Ligand binder design. Sequence first.
Ligand SMILES: Nc1ncnc2c1ncn2[C@@H]1O[C@H](COP(=O)(O)OP(=O)(O)OP(O)(O)=S)[C@@H](O)[C@H]1O
Ligand SMILES: Nc1ncnc2c1ncn2[C@@H]1O[C@H](COP(=O)(O)OP(=O)(O)OP(O)(O)=S)[C@@H](O)[C@H]1O
Ligand SMILES: Nc1ncnc2c1ncn2[C@@H]1O[C@H](COP(=O)(O)OP(=O)(O)OP(O)(O)=S)[C@@H](O)[C@H]1O
Ligand SMILES: Nc1ncnc2c1ncn2[C@@H]1O[C@H](COP(=O)(O)OP(=O)(O)OP(O)(O)=S)[C@@H](O)[C@H]1O
Lengths: 66, 431, 389, 416, 425, 137, 48
Amino acid sequence: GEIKSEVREQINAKVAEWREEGKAEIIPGVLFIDEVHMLDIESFSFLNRALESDMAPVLIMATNRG
Amino acid sequence: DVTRIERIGAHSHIRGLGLDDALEPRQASQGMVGQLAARRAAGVVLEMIREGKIAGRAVLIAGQPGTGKTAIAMGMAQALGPDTPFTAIAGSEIFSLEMSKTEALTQAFRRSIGVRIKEETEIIEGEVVEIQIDRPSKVGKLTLKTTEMETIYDLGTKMIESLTKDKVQAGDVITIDKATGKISKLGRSFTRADAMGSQTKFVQCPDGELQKRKEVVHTVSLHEIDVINSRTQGFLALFSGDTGEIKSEVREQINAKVAEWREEGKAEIIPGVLFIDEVHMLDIESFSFLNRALESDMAPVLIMATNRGITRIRGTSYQSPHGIPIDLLDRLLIVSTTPYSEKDTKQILRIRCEEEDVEMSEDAYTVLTRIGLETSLRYAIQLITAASLVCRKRKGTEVQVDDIKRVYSLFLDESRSTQYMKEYQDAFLFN
Amino acid sequence: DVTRIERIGAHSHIRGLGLDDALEPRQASQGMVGQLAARRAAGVVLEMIREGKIAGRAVLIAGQPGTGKTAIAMGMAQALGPDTPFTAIAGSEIFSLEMSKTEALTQAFRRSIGVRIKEETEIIEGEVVEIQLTLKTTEMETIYDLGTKMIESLTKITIDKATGKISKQKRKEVVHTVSLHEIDVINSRTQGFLALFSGDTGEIKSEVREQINAKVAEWREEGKAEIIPGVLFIDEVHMLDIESFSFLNRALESDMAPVLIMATNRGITRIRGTSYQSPHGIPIDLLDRLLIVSTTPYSEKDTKQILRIRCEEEDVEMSEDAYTVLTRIGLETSLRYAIQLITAASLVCRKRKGTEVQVDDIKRVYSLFLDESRSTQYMKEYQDAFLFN
Amino acid sequence: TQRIASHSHVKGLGLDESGLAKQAASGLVGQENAREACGVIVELIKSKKMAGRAVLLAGPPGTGKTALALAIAQELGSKVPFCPMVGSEVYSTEIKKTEVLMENFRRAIGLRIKETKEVYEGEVTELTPCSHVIIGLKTAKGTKQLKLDPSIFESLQKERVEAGDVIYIEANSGAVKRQGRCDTYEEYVPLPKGDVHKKKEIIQDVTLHDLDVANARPQGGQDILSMMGQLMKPKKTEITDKLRGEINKVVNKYIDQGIAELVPGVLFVDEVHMLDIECFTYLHRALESSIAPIVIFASNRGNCVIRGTEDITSPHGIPLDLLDRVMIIRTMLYTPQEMKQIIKIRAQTEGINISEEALNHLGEIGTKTTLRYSVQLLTPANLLAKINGKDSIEKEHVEEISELFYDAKSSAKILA
Amino acid sequence: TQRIASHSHVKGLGLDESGLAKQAASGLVGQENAREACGVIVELIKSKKMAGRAVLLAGPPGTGKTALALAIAQELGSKVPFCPMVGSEVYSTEIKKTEVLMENFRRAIGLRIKETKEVYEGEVTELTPCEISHVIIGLKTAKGTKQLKLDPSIFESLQKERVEAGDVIYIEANSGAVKRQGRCDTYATEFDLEAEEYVPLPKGDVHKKKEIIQDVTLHDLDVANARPQGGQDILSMMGQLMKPKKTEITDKLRGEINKVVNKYIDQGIAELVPGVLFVDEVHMLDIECFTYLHRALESSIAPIVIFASNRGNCVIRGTEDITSPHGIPLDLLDRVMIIRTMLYTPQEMKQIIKIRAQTEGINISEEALNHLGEIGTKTTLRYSVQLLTPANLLAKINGKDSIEKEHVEEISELFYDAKSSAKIL
Amino acid sequence: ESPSELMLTLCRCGESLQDVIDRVAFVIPPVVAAPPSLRVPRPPPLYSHRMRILRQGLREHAAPYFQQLRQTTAPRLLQFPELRLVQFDSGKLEALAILLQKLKSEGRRVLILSQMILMLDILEMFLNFHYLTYVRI
Amino acid sequence: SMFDLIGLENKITRHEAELLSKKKIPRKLMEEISTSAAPAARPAAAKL
Ligand SMILES: Nc1ncnc2c1ncn2[C@@H]1O[C@H](COP(=O)(O)OP(=O)(O)OP(O)(O)=S)[C@@H](O)[C@H]1O
Ligand SMILES: Nc1ncnc2c1ncn2[C@@H]1O[C@H](COP(=O)(O)OP(=O)(O)OP(O)(O)=S)[C@@H](O)[C@H]1O
Ligand SMILES: Nc1ncnc2c1ncn2[C@@H]1O[C@H](COP(=O)(O)OP(=O)(O)OP(O)(O)=S)[C@@H](O)[C@H]1O
Ligand SMILES: Nc1ncnc2c1ncn2[C@@H]1O[C@H](COP(=O)(O)OP(=O)(O)OP(O)(O)=S)[C@@H](O)[C@H]1O
């Protein structure tokens, strides 16, 4: 339930540190939100800024709405 | 003279359903007068409940306010008697922060099915005369005593540990479960009670056989079994109510195990009645669940009461006859209550005055009956006690029409209060 | 300079109500200018709080935005001092996932009443390094018997003469003021005092609250405690529900009720949780229990004096022409906007290697930063580009 | 020294011995008919024969509904449990509104337990065990040596008693407490009745809700695993109806045995209009119950929309079917003379001396704005009078305090 | 290598000494007025004496508001706490949104605390307890051997780590933390095969005291003291088994921590570095959150707050009918300084596209750059910069090392923008 | 009874899930505090006795599981520089690793000559990284 | 304590409770017990 933001910042910093020190290699994956029209405005607003991070995957969304 | 927790309530005078063995409602019997057709229908449904053959039959009691629906329900509960589960809830009680409305309805259903489980235990009880040196792998002797027998038992390691852990002492009455080797100390010897006194309790020596077969019948409900099996210490939820959405798999396992016991003759299923007063307060989701919860083989008889006209179902914009979806109305039989004539209102008031233990003049009865016909039955019932108090303050033995007029002027009914409000409505907040 | 946790906030200049002994408000004093009638009303309310005899009195500070209602509240808090409880919340803070709105308001009410308890301890100890116990001091030398093992830790200071409590030259007396909320959170659990910090208190039961009220009344009668009635300040009270307001109605009728100060800046609006319109977003039944103090919009000279006080609070020197330009701006846009222009213009002058804020600095800051009206106009001009109009 | 509340002047209903209302008595002026109704329902509560009877005090704001309920409470005394409540209190994040209502019903029924409590005290433990425990107790007045159980011995060890540490030990429970370690050999017992064998008749008042919550979870640190129950947050739960029935049965047993007395009390629901339709619908069945208390509702609403319905308007914000089962007491507006009487009563209660012309001007202000506003000006006006060296409130002070503070109507006009 | 994000090109505000914005510098082009205002705000944050000052970045989407906020962050540097936040993050399932806002306020205030660290490290020569008030432990390094009397807590942590003898351990006295980092090197030769790892014995002193600077925020102190993790008493240990939920930290804990921090500042062992809280999509906050921000910005402890909103006359969330300029209540707009971002000319868009191409390592021909600028004028700036990577991929598929116009045309045909998609809808 | 399994992995298709946790478990709280204490002058005897009874009883109940109770609930207050950073910080050690592994397989022995004592300490660390036994002169 | 129903779950069963109710030392026998002398007539072991 609601992993702390500072914990995630620490994870990110240590993963970058691992990458610089030859331990870790980052594999960016794909997040597929099927029926993305079921998200509300708040979720879309978060998605806007969640995509600005360097640890953000490629996002595929599908929707039949018009 | 002495006040108990139960005292004069609204329905305390309904001792049962006043109908013959032919299910013909007597005009006035068991504290219930009038509503002949609805009482006959209630008798038929009561016989259905007593036979316990048909599962998930739903009955709706409909009618105007003050027409006796809860009176008929309480009469059914009083004729049914204890040891047949009659669960009474309001439709509001299912909206809980603990669990979903579906879960609450499921618990209410599981609470209306009663299980009588019998077991044989084969225990040993006796006053302990001696426990001797176990120092050797430890081995010891235990001497047990009834008023007719005493025997000496050779103790294994586990029994020795149990006896030393309970600090079993010479001169106390224990019971030993042979299957489990479980020691229960229930009292101290009859050779003292002789200067003691503490958490201890004093018991006289058992008489008869040291070893006794015993049949104990345990009465539980399906809900109780569910919450006992829900978690390791789940029986505490029978007290706190902290049940939290018992798993469906647990309920299926319990249903299967109960069916096994019933085939084995171990368990006896007593199906009961779930009474939901004010069923119009349920959501369309709850009615949808009731549609299917009734179609289970372990479903009780569902009785619901509603005074609604043609209202919108809660959670929807749809107008349905009793605030209940039409698919659920097809699944039930509707008992309708006719309003009360002057004779019926007078009889009801007489029975209520008998319950209150208040004596009223005949002119007072006429005036109060007219007041009830004008205003409402419940208002007249309340005026009964109010006028009794006003009479007592007057140092009179019989309530007169003057006292009824006094309490009528002191206490308003809905219509007169609404009128006084209406002429002053600019002084009241929000219209 | 060293940056402390307390920095230059909006109301840092306010040291209290600038009030005479007759409660008459000085034109400018203790960081507050103008609002003579409102300041006088706050002074009489403050005398009511200090007297502390009448329980559950409610005062509402009403006026246009930026008229100093929160400033009057902070001045009242500064005048009241740290020894009487002053609980400040926003109307939004009662909407909690831990507790109901009723519980949040109850806790806020019980955080404003303080019980003062003075205890006599026993402390004589001093300069000792020896081991068994004998003690020596510049004026004292003593021996003490002992029949317990606590001395082992004491070896490696001062002790209680009564119970022998050990901790690293006379009886001395200690005063502790404890709020009712602290008392019932400490006594709600085995380690309930932790919930005073974590907030994991979760709807203290009415039973314990009743018992603690009874015990506090007993202590008051027996002289062991005295009640220090405080004041609860609810800023932006229009965020409360109709349920919250109805609770406040009868919460104020306890003898353990603090003095309630509420601030609101809206006219006849909808009460939250209802479709009804009421003068302050507050139901009329609660307004019935309130004394309402209204704040007048500031004049030109009052605005200039406020700007002067804020400038000397922020330690920025401006020219007189800059003061007149900024006063015109404040009268044209808002007081808060000018207050912020002060800091921005000080920064612009600093980049310039200047020492005094000139009119050109204020013009530059006015160009860089917009008020609501100018931004709204530029928005209207680009209406289509913006989202969801 | 205690503080003056809004209802601190309400000492009772102020009725004569025939039940009629004195014009002004025990802090109440006017509302004679409502007061007489409150008196008859006080007699109803003291009769303790009727359960789940409901009374609604309906009238404009400020007409003394809450004052009348508090007067009823005063007329009953602290013997009878008076549970005050607001309709907003049913909305809890922990339990459902129905559980909150049921609990408040539980705590409006009181139980009075009579016990003859025996205890053994003294300088104590002049002996510890001379199969048995022998302890000598000396308390100035004398000394007794008594024989205890071995179980009392284990409890005594648990309490780490030593020879010379005053203790409690009760014959009715076997519970033991070492009250002190008076360093004479840190507290020693007094000597009014400083006997070793102490027994006196005790009465403790407990509500049925207290019994329910006591039986809701284990008793805490005594048991192996209930010790970890003390580390939990004290969440309130939906006490099952079966537990209530069982507690009722045991309470009835002990009422029959004559050691307990049933004192049913009053549940006062102020701002009943804040309950939603679910709460009222439950209240139907809660009032049908024979184990329910006497319930007093108060509403100032004119034709409000019932909460939780969004469309349905009923007279007092209360559903019609609930109004059908309650008795209505009508509170009316106050004449200016009654307002003057009330202002004088409040001034006297607050220790405020008021001149005659000041009282008349304040009564005029109240007739213009409202009774509450005029009652509120008293303390600030007294403070102003004290500032200006006076001990009586004069017309100038009330004028100045009226100019400093506004009523709802004046503020609304400024806002419009 | 490092992954390229949508803002990786912004390295600052590109302002000269006098604060005037260079047309293109530090990865930013245009928005000179907004960049200059942001430079003023950077100076405000560096001044460090003003608390609770809020700025609002207002302009249509695509105008660079988040870019300017991150440019401010770059200007400040990693030393100053920059807490980014979105309005949608307040709606937590565990704590009230007011608590989330206050926590974000508290983690935008940073502390640099100099702490003396007491270290015991060495080979365990002996471990002798005394009834259990003591443990006598001998520690051996290259410098020498010492035996120390340590608390029962350290002994019982040593039992947790299971250190017996010949084990190299690291004890931090402050936290009571024991680390068994292996067995001594001298015991490697004992056996051909042993189931542990050998570490050389420490070469320093047994008892080392070290001064270190710790970077923490006020929120770190609040959370540590509201969910205590130090201390070895059983009561706190059993509380550690609870699910670590976020709790509504009370104002009393924050006041106590304020007192502690003030004491540290007086003692010279701490320095306050108040930072900035960046709430993007502030329009997502409901009326309750804005009305709380009213109070949260009056606090003398508050950080600098930056808001960004692209909405024109949106209804305030939670109000259901109240239209305010930027989705933000007017009473809050009275507390902020508004920095407006303007739309871009075709030339500025072309410059931005070239900068993004440079950052993504993509060679684009002049024809392709002009065509992509034309597309961006027709569609949007965001659409054009997104075409660059797919166009480069197609160019590599064709075997060319630069993006020609045909690749841009192909990618334009394969993908659509919101306007074309809306047309076909 | 009920079923159960350990064959369940997390993301790797591999080892015993405590090695996984150890591999990825590195965060330390920025601040660690002992629980706040209630500073009461002369606490009441009943309260102190109750607290003592509770603490004593909770212990001797967790005593059978005290070691487990502590492995859990023990925060990570320290994270050390991992041993692999040696030999990654230096290219000399990176080449020496290959050289020494080859020399080990070939059976030869080695003596490493370095002027710096401190680099000898670093070499001790590096040799332990490769499980190579040595003597220091 | 007589209203402590939850505690009794750890202690006894209903058959045990019915047993106890039937077997509780009657009042008369209590005074008989407290009057009479100790009947210490144990025949001692025989091993026949
Ligand atoms: N024979 C009777 N039939 C109906 N009500 C009776 C009868 N005798 C007494 N009453 C009383 O009449 C009142 C009417 O209430 P009920 O109708 O039984 O309950 P209810 O839940 O309100 O159902 P309603 O009013 O029809 S919606 C109660 O106080 C009953 O105790
Ligand atoms: N106490 C007051 N005295 C005089 N005018 C007031 C007062 N309170 C509010 N107003 C007026 O109300 C206007 C708007 O107030 P706000 O608090 O910003 O929003 P509002 O009053 O709720 O209005 P809306 O549009 O109905 S939400 C102010 O600009 C004032 O003109
Ligand atoms: N008849 C009365 N005699 C004396 N004081 C009264 C009387 N009625 C009301 N008061 C007092 O006048 C003030 C306002 O009356 P309240 O009792 O608080 O309001 P209420 O009528 O009880 O409840 P509301 O306002 O109608 S919802 C309080 O201080 C009361 O104690
Ligand atoms: N003046 C600028 N110079 C350089 N890059 C810019 C400029 N303005 C915007 N960008 C960038 O162009 C892309 C889109 O701008 P963003 O700032 O991410 O979105 P946005 O339009 O600022 O968000 P909002 O809040 O709706 S304005 C990002 O890669 C930014 O870095």
